[PDB]
Amino acid sequence: DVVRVHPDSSLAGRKGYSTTEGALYSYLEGTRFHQTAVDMAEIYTMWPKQTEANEQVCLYALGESIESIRQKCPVDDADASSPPKTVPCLCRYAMTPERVTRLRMNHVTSIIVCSSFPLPKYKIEGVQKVKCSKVM
């Protein structure tokens, strides 16, 4: 089974990956992004609601350690993580595990996040919310 990835993904045109078809959720096994993916997946379990989970994912992309994310969870409940979306949207600001990995590698102090990545209505330091040019 092929894993569908973003058109701007570095996995595009590779064996097991495609842009137009494939699985929309994956831990990206066999790649480096795998680690980021599972970390992101765990975040999505730590915060059940998408808004605060996406806030934690944004903080993760800004370089904050996954361990501090773990301590920030109000409860100690630990459930199995679902694979994160490989194509949450189709614009250049898609918060894929690949993009999060790249942002962490570049150690960016500010990120631009589209509207397909729902965030808290209050300000987040280092995050600028923009309109999603085209969606999934």
- Contact set with Zn ion (CB under 5 A): 89, 91, 114, 116, 132
Q: 21, 75, 106, 107: which one contacts a second copy (CB under 8 A)?
A: 75
Query: In the complex, what is the shortest distance from the CB of residue 44 to a second copy, in angstroms, rounded to a whole number?
Result: 11
89 binds, among Zn ion, a second copy, none (CB under 5 to 8 A by kind): Zn ion
Q: 63, 64, 115, 126: which one contacts a second copy (CB under 8 A)?
A: 115
Query: In the complex, what is the shortest distance from the CB of residue 136 to Zn ion, in angstroms, rounded to a whole number?
Result: 8
Do residues 112 and 95 touch, judged by C-beta distance below 8 A?
no
Q: 4, 36, 40, 41: which one contacts a second copy (CB under 8 A)?
A: 41
Query: In the complex, what is the shortest distance from the CB of residue 63 to a second copy, in angstroms, rounded to a whole number?
Result: 20
Q: How many chain residues touch a second copy (CB under 8 A)?
A: 44
Cα separation, 24 vs 100, whole angstroms: 17
The DSSP bridge partners found for residue 112 are: 128
The DSSP bridge partners found for residue 23 are: 3
Residue numbering of the annotated binding site for Zn(2+): 89, 91, 114, 132
Largest CA distance in the chain: 42
Cα separation, 15 vs 55, whole angstroms: 33
| Closest by CA position to 95, among listed 119, 72, 73, 117 | 117
**Is 128 among the residues that bind a second copy (CB under 8 A)?**
yes
**Is 7 among the residues that bind a second copy (CB under 8 A)?**
no
Helix 50-61 vs helix 97-106: crossing angle, to nearest 10 = 40
